[PDB]
Design a protein around this motif. Sequence first.
Motif, PDB file in Angstrom:
ATOM      1  N   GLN A 125      -1.252  17.527   8.019  1.00 53.78           N
ATOM      2  CA  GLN A 125      -2.182  18.257   7.170  1.00 53.78           C
ATOM      3  C   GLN A 125      -1.472  19.381   6.425  1.00 53.78           C
ATOM      4  OE1 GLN A 125      -6.804  19.131   8.500  1.00 53.78           O
ATOM      5  NE2 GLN A 125      -5.274  20.745   8.857  1.00 53.78           N
ATOM      6  N   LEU A 149      -3.751   8.831   6.959  1.00 57.90           N
ATOM      7  CA  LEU A 149      -4.363   8.410   8.218  1.00 57.90           C
ATOM      8  C   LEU A 149      -5.113   7.090   8.060  1.00 57.90           C
ATOM      9  CD1 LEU A 149      -5.754  11.857   9.513  1.00 57.90           C
ATOM     10  CD2 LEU A 149      -3.633  10.709  10.249  1.00 57.90           C
ATOM     11  N   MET A 150      -5.701   6.839   6.882  1.00 61.11           N
ATOM     12  CA  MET A 150      -6.451   5.605   6.652  1.00 61.11           C
ATOM     13  C   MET A 150      -5.557   4.375   6.534  1.00 61.11           C
ATOM     14  SD  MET A 150      -9.420   7.224   4.174  1.00 61.11           S
ATOM     15  CE  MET A 150     -10.184   5.691   3.663  1.00 61.11           C
ATOM     16  N   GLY A 179      -5.585  12.491   4.592  1.00 63.14           N
ATOM     17  CA  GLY A 179      -6.555  11.512   5.060  1.00 63.14           C
ATOM     18  C   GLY A 179      -6.231  10.103   4.600  1.00 63.14           C
ATOM     19  N   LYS A 180      -5.750   9.957   3.353  1.00 63.54           N
ATOM     20  CA  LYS A 180      -5.325   8.643   2.883  1.00 63.54           C
ATOM     21  C   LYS A 180      -4.216   8.096   3.766  1.00 63.54           C
ATOM     22  CE  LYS A 180      -6.318   9.603  -1.986  1.00 63.54           C
ATOM     23  NZ  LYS A 180      -5.656   9.675  -3.304  1.00 63.54           N
ATOM     24  N   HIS A 183     -14.401   9.188   1.725  1.00 62.90           N
ATOM     25  CA  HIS A 183     -13.520  10.121   2.422  1.00 62.90           C
ATOM     26  C   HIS A 183     -13.838  11.566   2.049  1.00 62.90           C
ATOM     27  CE1 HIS A 183      -9.137  11.806   2.796  1.00 62.90           C
ATOM     28  NE2 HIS A 183      -9.915  12.266   3.757  1.00 62.90           N
ATOM     29  N   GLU A 184     -14.039  11.836   0.756  1.00 65.52           N
ATOM     30  CA  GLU A 184     -14.433  13.179   0.339  1.00 65.52           C
ATOM     31  C   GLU A 184     -15.736  13.615   1.000  1.00 65.52           C
ATOM     32  OE1 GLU A 184     -15.468  13.588  -3.819  1.00 65.52           O
ATOM     33  OE2 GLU A 184     -15.054  15.750  -3.736  1.00 65.52           O
ATOM     34  N   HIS A 225      -1.066  15.804  13.901  1.00 64.85           N
ATOM     35  CA  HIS A 225      -2.035  15.775  12.809  1.00 64.85           C
ATOM     36  C   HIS A 225      -1.982  17.061  11.989  1.00 64.85           C
ATOM     37  CE1 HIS A 225      -6.595  15.917  11.636  1.00 64.85           C
ATOM     38  NE2 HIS A 225      -5.836  15.649  10.591  1.00 64.85           N
ATOM     39  N   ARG A 284      -6.776  15.078  -0.718  1.00 66.15           N
ATOM     40  CA  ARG A 284      -7.150  14.076   0.272  1.00 66.15           C
ATOM     41  C   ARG A 284      -5.974  13.205   0.699  1.00 66.15           C
ATOM     42  NH1 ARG A 284     -11.365  15.008  -2.897  1.00 66.15           N
ATOM     43  NH2 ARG A 284     -10.943  13.298  -4.372  1.00 66.15           N
ATOM     44  N   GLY A 311     -10.076  14.491  10.164  1.00 66.10           N
ATOM     45  CA  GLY A 311      -8.929  13.655  10.489  1.00 66.10           C
ATOM     46  C   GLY A 311      -9.054  12.999  11.852  1.00 66.10           C
ATOM     47  N   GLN A 349     -14.913  14.649   4.467  1.00 61.92           N
ATOM     48  CA  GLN A 349     -14.175  15.904   4.448  1.00 61.92           C
ATOM     49  C   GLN A 349     -15.109  17.080   4.188  1.00 61.92           C
ATOM     50  OE1 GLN A 349      -9.673  16.265   2.578  1.00 61.92           O
ATOM     51  NE2 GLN A 349     -11.414  16.832   1.268  1.00 61.92           N
ATOM     52  N   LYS A 404       0.821  -1.204   0.000  1.00 54.02           N
ATOM     53  CA  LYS A 404       0.000   0.000   0.000  1.00 54.02           C
ATOM     54  C   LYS A 404       0.858   1.259   0.000  1.00 54.02           C
ATOM     55  CE  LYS A 404      -3.662   0.014   2.776  1.00 54.02           C
ATOM     56  NZ  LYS A 404      -4.337   0.295   4.088  1.00 54.02           N
ATOM     57  N   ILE A 421     -17.005   4.096   5.376  1.00 53.01           N
ATOM     58  CA  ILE A 421     -15.552   4.136   5.232  1.00 53.01           C
ATOM     59  C   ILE A 421     -14.923   2.851   5.761  1.00 53.01           C
ATOM     60  CG2 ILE A 421     -13.440   5.289   6.051  1.00 53.01           C
ATOM     61  CD1 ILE A 421     -15.087   7.937   5.897  1.00 53.01           C
ATOM     62  N   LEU A 459     -11.122  10.034  11.345  1.00 55.48           N
ATOM     63  CA  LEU A 459     -10.363   8.935  10.751  1.00 55.48           C
ATOM     64  C   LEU A 459      -9.422   8.292  11.766  1.00 55.48           C
ATOM     65  CD1 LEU A 459      -9.459  10.512   7.259  1.00 55.48           C
ATOM     66  CD2 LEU A 459     -11.310   8.869   7.743  1.00 55.48           C
ATOM     67  N   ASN A 496     -12.502   0.617   3.517  1.00 57.36           N
ATOM     68  CA  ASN A 496     -11.115   0.618   3.974  1.00 57.36           C
ATOM     69  C   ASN A 496     -10.737  -0.659   4.734  1.00 57.36           C
ATOM     70  OD1 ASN A 496      -8.642   2.208   4.098  1.00 57.36           O
ATOM     71  ND2 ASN A 496      -9.013   2.415   6.293  1.00 57.36           N
ATOM     72  N   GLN A 507     -10.215   1.625  -4.246  1.00 58.19           N
ATOM     73  CA  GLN A 507      -9.613   2.893  -3.840  1.00 58.19           C
ATOM     74  C   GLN A 507     -10.513   4.066  -4.206  1.00 58.19           C
ATOM     75  OE1 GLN A 507      -7.828   5.841  -2.280  1.00 58.19           O
ATOM     76  NE2 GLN A 507      -6.794   3.854  -2.051  1.00 58.19           N
ATOM     77  N   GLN A 514     -13.195   4.217  -1.521  1.00 54.81           N
ATOM     78  CA  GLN A 514     -12.604   4.887  -0.363  1.00 54.81           C
ATOM     79  C   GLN A 514     -12.581   6.393  -0.563  1.00 54.81           C
ATOM     80  OE1 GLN A 514      -9.529   1.093   0.400  1.00 54.81           O
ATOM     81  NE2 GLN A 514      -8.675   3.171   0.315  1.00 54.81           N
ATOM     82  N   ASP A 515     -12.173   6.836  -1.757  1.00 51.18           N
ATOM     83  CA  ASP A 515     -12.014   8.263  -1.986  1.00 51.18           C
ATOM     84  C   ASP A 515     -13.351   8.995  -1.975  1.00 51.18           C
ATOM     85  OD1 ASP A 515     -11.287  10.553  -4.446  1.00 51.18           O
ATOM     86  OD2 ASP A 515     -10.060  10.405  -2.629  1.00 51.18           O
TER      87      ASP A 515
END
Lengths: 224, 224
Positions: A167, A185-186, A182-183, B163-164, A163, A179, B182, B167, A122, B139, B185, B143, B156, B159-160
């Motif tokens: 960011q 953090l995921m 956040g990815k 996540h969006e 964090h 994003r 965040g 956000q 990943k 999520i 998450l 994820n 993916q 996920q995006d």
Amino acid sequence: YNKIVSHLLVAEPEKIYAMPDPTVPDSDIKALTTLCDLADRELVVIIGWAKHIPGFSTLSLADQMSLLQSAWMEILILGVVYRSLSFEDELVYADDYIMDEDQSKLAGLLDLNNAILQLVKKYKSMKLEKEEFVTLKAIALANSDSMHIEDVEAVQKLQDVLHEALQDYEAGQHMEDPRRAGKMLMTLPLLRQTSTKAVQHFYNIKLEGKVPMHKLFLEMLEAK
Amino acid sequence: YNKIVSHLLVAEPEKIYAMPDPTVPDSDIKALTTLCDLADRELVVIIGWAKHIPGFSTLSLADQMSLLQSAWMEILILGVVYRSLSFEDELVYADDYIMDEDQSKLAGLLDLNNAILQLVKKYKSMKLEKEEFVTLKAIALANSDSMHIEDVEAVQKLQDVLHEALQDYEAGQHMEDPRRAGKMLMTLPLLRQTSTKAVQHFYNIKLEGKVPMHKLFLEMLEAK
Ligand SMILES: Oc1ccc(C(c2ccc(O)cc2)C(Cl)(Cl)Cl)cc1
Ligand SMILES: Oc1ccc(C(c2ccc(O)cc2)C(Cl)(Cl)Cl)cc1
């Protein structure tokens, strides 16, 4: 970019050698002994490293220890993951200790190391940078979910400082992906999953009593 | 606010009753049987719910199943956590099945339920909203880190999209905290940790053979 990120980069420890004993025949006991010995010396280095994280040394000694006792395996695993990014299906525990699939099977670690290789895969796809690695190590320490925190608000503030650093770094360095923070953090759930399974596995090794383990490693293992 | 969030709110399933058998004496076997029976019926509802998540039903049937087989326990646990937010030291598995500390001990679930209560405590402090709960369930599904995904890029993308949505929801609804998405998450690692331990515990219960379990529950458990 972000000063906290630049600070964590200069605080990064030097590489450590595994030094497997060249007089000992290869075996599962030798591999596990080598790995636990290396982890014990890395733990010393991690404790010294954490004192460079803004605000960490102002926590009570008990809270510093609680965070480290909850996060140590995640921090160790993130290190092997990062060292392995330029390799294929191999885990770089040290420059002198690189484990392929065959050696993982011989050590009884195939299932665990395949989960670590999932983390590697990943991060390779995301093109994980050293700046992001060191910030994620610090976030994993602050976000480790110890049940024994005295000053919860101070620990939450530490989480927030790190964090924000992630960011801010991503906002300035990766405008093409709004994003990306956040990815990053995921990816922490898989890190937690793999650490949870590793602590389980090596606690069982501790109980069987065939692999010698040093004091600090045993202290961290017996906390968890 | 965000349309995906509003869509997940209207797709939220109705509440399900546990219906513990009033003719059966209370025991650890009765509690575990009641819980696994309730989970089996919730799993049916989760499979139907996931079809409302944008893009989920366009995945191959194998990828839909892989995501569900990796995430099911996280989704179940997030549900109990959310239902428990207005309670103190109790877990609301259903309106007719609320477990306090004493009942957890009798069922052998004290350590597991205390970890779930740690999740509850964190979400109470963050004032978790229903909008954020349903988005985090989605999520967690996307994820879930299955090792068996065929179309990695499509997963993916899922996920995006979610996540969006998180956000965008936080940017519009919580301008006072530009880091709230965040923070949300960063609660997922503890959810993964607790799910990993729960699957372990109930797999051991499956092996002991004293608690009857239905087909779907057993299929999800035997995947993991
Ligand atoms: O297959 C594995 C072997 C060693 C480890 C750990 C490990 C992780 C990182 C290191 O730098 C050294 C050892 C412990 Cl701490 Cl369990 Cl020995 C983890 C997984
Ligand atoms: O102490 C626990 C008891 C049941 C559960 C689960 C559970 C979680 C959520 C539910 O809505 C129902 C059961 C399973 Cl799936 Cl393991 Cl039975 C988890 C932890």
